[PDB]
Symmetry: C4
Subunit: 31 residues, 4 copies
């Protein structure tokens, strides 16, 4: 399941990105 393992990692990174993006959005709005 190599391709699934990589797809899994990608999905995990993508979720981190999305979380960081909302955090940046909040910082930007706050100032």
């Amino acid at each position: 399941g190599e391709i699934k393992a990589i797809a899994q990692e990608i999905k995990a990174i993508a979720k981190e990105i999305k979380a960081i993006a909302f955090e940046i959005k909040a910082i930007a709005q706050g100032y």
Copy 2:
């Protein structure tokens, strides 16, 4: 799926990130 399904979930998240990136960009420009 399985890997099609995961690919579609990644694609959905990537679309969300892109949307939030555009929002951040507009907020950052406005200020």
Copy 3:
């Protein structure tokens, strides 16, 4: 080649995201 087509779309979106991210970074630094 369904899975390749979706992987292709994902990669294209990811590149857009990365471009928008450098743009936001430049706006943030500029102010």
Copy 4:
């Protein structure tokens, strides 16, 4: 690859985005 290769290229780009997101976050916080 092919789809493994594309998956690895997506993963690399996602890592770059995440890195730039952290940079943006730090810049935005600092100011």
